[PDB]
Amino acid sequence: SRLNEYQVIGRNLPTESVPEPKLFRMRIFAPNTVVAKSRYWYFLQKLHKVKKASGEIVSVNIISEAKPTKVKTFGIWLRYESRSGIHNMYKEYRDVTRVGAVETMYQDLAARHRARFRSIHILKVVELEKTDDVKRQYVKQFLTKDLKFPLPHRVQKSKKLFQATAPTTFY
Amino acid sequence: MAKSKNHTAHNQTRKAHRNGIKKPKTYKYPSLKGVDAKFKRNHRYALHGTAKALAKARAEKSA
Amino acid sequence: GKSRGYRSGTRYAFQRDFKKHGAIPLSTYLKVYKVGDIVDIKANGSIQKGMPHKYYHGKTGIVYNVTKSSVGVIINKVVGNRYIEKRVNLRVEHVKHSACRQEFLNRVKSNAAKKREAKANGETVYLKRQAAKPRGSRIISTEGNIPQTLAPVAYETFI
Amino acid sequence: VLKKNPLKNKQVLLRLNPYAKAYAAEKVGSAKVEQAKVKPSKGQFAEVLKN
Amino acid sequence: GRDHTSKQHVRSGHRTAPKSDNVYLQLLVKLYSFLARRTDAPFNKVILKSLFLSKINRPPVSVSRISRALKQKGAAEKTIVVVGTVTDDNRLLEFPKATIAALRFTAGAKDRILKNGGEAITLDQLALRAPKGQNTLIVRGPRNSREAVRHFGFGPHKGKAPRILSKGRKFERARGRRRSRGFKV
Amino acid sequence: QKEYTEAERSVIKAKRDAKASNSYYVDAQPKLVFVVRIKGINKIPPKPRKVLQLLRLTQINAGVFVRLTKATSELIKLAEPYVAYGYPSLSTIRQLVYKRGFGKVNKQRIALSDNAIIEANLGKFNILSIEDLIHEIYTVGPNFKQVSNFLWPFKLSNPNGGFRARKFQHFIQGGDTGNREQFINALVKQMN
Amino acid sequence: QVAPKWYQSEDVPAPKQTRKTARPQKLRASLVPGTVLILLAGRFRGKRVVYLKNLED
RNA sequence: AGCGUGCUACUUAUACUUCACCGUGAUUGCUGUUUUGACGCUUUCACGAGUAGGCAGGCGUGGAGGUCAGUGACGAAGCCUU
RNA sequence: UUGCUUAAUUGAACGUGGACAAUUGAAUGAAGAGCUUUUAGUGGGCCAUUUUUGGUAAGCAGAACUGGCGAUGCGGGAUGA
RNA sequence: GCCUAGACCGAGGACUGCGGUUUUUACCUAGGAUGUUGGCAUAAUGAUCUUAAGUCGCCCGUCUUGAAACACGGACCAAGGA
DSSP states (O other): OOOEEEEEEEEEOOOSSOSSOOOEEEEEEESSHHHHHHHHHHHHTTTSSOOTTTEEEEEEEEOOOSOTTSOEEEEEEEEEEOSSOEEOOEEEEEESSHHHHHHHHHHHHHHHSOOOGGGEEEEEEEEOOSGGGOOOHHHHTTSSTTOOOOOOSOOOOOSSSOOSSOOOOOO | OOOOOOOOOTTHHHHHHHSOOBOOOOOSSOOOTTSOHHHHHHHHHHHHHHHHHHHHHHHHHHO | OOOOOTTTTOTTTTSOOTTOOSSOOTHHHHOOOOTTOEEEEOOOTTOOTTOOOGGGTTOEEEEEEEOSSEEEEEEEEEETTEEEEEEEEEEGGGEEEOTHHHHHHHHHHHHHHHHHHHHHHTOOOOOOOOOOOOOOOEEEEOTTOOOEEOOOOOOOOOO | OOOOOTTTOHHHHHHHOTHHHHHHHTTGGGOOOOOOOOOTTSSGGGGGTOO | OOOOSSOTTOOOOSOSSOSOOOHHHHHHHHHHHHHHHHSOOHHHHHHHHHTTOOSTTSOOEEHHHHHHHHTSTTOTTSEEEEEEEEEOOTTOSOOOOOEEEEEEEOHHHHHHHHHTTOEEEOHHHHHHHOTTOTTEEEOOOOSTTSSGGGGTTOOTTOOOOOOOSOOSTTSSOSSBBOGGGSOBO | OHHHHHHHHHHHHHHHHHHHTTEEEEOOOOSEEEEEEOSOSSSOOHHHHHHHHHTTOOSTTEEEEEEOSHHHHHHHHHTGGGEEEEOOOHHHHHHHHHHHOEEEETTEEEEOOSHHHHHHHHGGGTOOSHHHHHHHHHTTOTTHHHHHHHBOOEEOOOOTTOOOSOOSSBGGGTSSBEEOTTTHHHHHHHHO | OOOOOTTOOOOOOOOOOOOOOOOOOOOOTTOOTTOEEEOOSSTTTTOEEEOOOOOOO
């Protein structure tokens, strides 16, 4: 979807026994803040004895990209459910924003593994600072020096239905 | 030759809720049917003397 | 064929509780029931006299009659599209006082007690019960409780 | 005989809400707020970036 | 599409005009329609509705019932209002002096009322001497003493009267009415 | 108007001060909700149907104001697969009341075209103007019940721009039913 | 056929007092005296002409 | 122009919103201006699927009482007819 | 008050007299509530989700809850209770 | 807050009301359309019938859970017919 990265902070409801419960933070990639709080509870209940009724949302904030105009390589650790079982994969993506690499990943797992948004957990999104940290060849080929490539067979979209001249595909 | 539907409760709650379900009307004095006779026998005399006492008190206030 | 006897389907309902068979503790026989009292009906399997029918096991009613060893209980039963007035004779072993009144009776006393205090003080006091309201605003201190970042964990087989 | 929208008809709006005129006069809908220029998130709230 | 919480286009279930085509009854309805509309007296609205009632819903009010009503505390000089026929009761030992407004009087009832020094007026004359029902006392006849009501709600263990043509030892008295012939209900 | 502005600025200042002092300001849970029935009248189970009748939502695109408590939250939870609800803002409430506001006068739907209509039915509750009614609705007041039951259920139109691709699924899953918590305002603007 | 009745009056009621007070017409900003115009209809359609005055009609 | 996924716009039900009209039910008021229709007029609001079935208001046919001092061989009734 | 009950002047039941007013004691809603008479048709059902029995299974036979079709047109599923 | 383009409609029928401007017992955009211009009245307009085009439309009655049915009655018309 058109996602954003959110800081969601929550805790168990204070009790006379426990008047200052521990605060828990997560980074959630959700289209909006309603899904952001919903996804937050979905993961605490997978890890802690807490519920939306017995808990409390403390803060929901957008984490904007630090350098939206810098090209980065993100490595993403996933855990998705297939038609047979549960698998972990690690995949790499090239983009300027952290959300955009996640958005590409959701499109990529839908296209290559038929994995839906509900079937995917993002364990970690990491910036690969060094060129040695990049493992996948489909993104290393864009890290070569003085990279040049043409775009053969350019197709021009026409406004008119009929064209009086022969087509060409030069570029 | 005529094996048919033996029984069903289908559609029975719909008919039960068209005009029902009506809770019974409550009154101040429930009927004393089924109450023990020994209590009910004495209760007759208690009520009789009770009204007599109230009558004599009210009778003095008029004359 | 079909069997629809009096105690059909009462295999577990009329059982005594685990490690609770034997004789009845005598607080059962010492409780005093008055006409108009509200009682929970729970059949005791060890006493077969004055035993309620399986429908009334778990019902609550009004005491309308007091006898030598039993009380008359009023139960409303749905029969078709209306309620039918039922009168069941129950030995006191199958009858317990319902605790719903003693909670409400205290609220009657408390409401009366609180209203005279405000009248004595000349102010107005509101005695209606209120449902749980949405919680108000608050400030969470992070001193000693800095948030810890949690993430979903990788899949793993534990067998 | 005919309902008129106060959000379109100005006379009906002034009839129902006499304060609307005042709301227009002081330009309350475009009121400038005077406040300091401070960044109160420079400290532990930068915990938003990483934790 | 509407989710109806109640049955639609349900009539009120009450009479808004007399089923009778009597022209003179329509004149009384005309007079009390104006009164119930222009006076705000609850007496006027009650009389207007009683003018709509059917014959079985206007039982005769005997001259003994009026005598009992005139013997209430402070009601001796009230105007007795009877929307219906006032019948005689030869079981009375005496009838007091009072004014009674009725739709109809029987010959015996009117004879007794006038002979004791009272007045027997129609309902139109009531509006002239009591347009707001001042110092009035509406009396209604017994409705459930009708013979048809005896058979209403007949069933086992009800105590009502069975619908029957003949009365005797051979007519509906053996089985279900006697334990010597099986059961009794 | 002054107290609305003061409340908004106070909340903003509280958030800023909490951000300054290494704390987290937890906003107060909303007291009012706007509920719009987005599902038709066919094939409804009896319990949600009774719930929807008790909310005065007997048609599609009908809106109602509900004060949030435990009882009302559990009522709305049963009707969730058929309604879209959320926390309404002051401007949304004002637009709703001005354009589609009708009162229940002697069981009749009467347009709130003058302050006399509102006074004749809510003067015993100290509601003298349409702004008094809007204030009572927005900040849930002591006479919220009478003011809200005075209002006839709002009859909205279909959204300009439509719904999402599929309505009858939760808003979290890409539908329209359920709680959207601030997007009820965009939906109402589409719908009012 | 049902004959007409006495209460079937024949008078024409007076019209209600309307509130349609006219207000002055507003022209386009591109319409200024001296502007060359093109006629689209009438006998002289397609002609180029000179705009001189805005009449009160 | 297939499959998985996302977005923007667009298309249209006897559905929703506004308006008109018809009917039903309720409702406002109407007699010193009631004024030859009060079984009438009038205001307002809501509602309108339907077999079996119930009820209401109406249309038509043969004859009877009353009335139109009704039509008619200068053409009744019947029949044919964008 | 009683003939019931208590060893009793104890209780039981029903009462007289007095105090506590709209926050009269949770929420929401209420084209209002209650009552009565009388009579029609019907008493072959079927389908979908979900629970479920027999059966290899069945557009099979039998149940539970709800909603529908029957009794229902309209937009979509090309076509279809 | 402001400017701006288009479409559909005009119910009602002396006055009464709520407001606003008040330069005013006056006026208004404020309890529902008026003003003006041209044309026509041998006609512009409206309706019906026949036909063409587009789109939709299975043969009615009946028993039936289910009928257009490869289920039954029905060639047609008049009069009689429960």
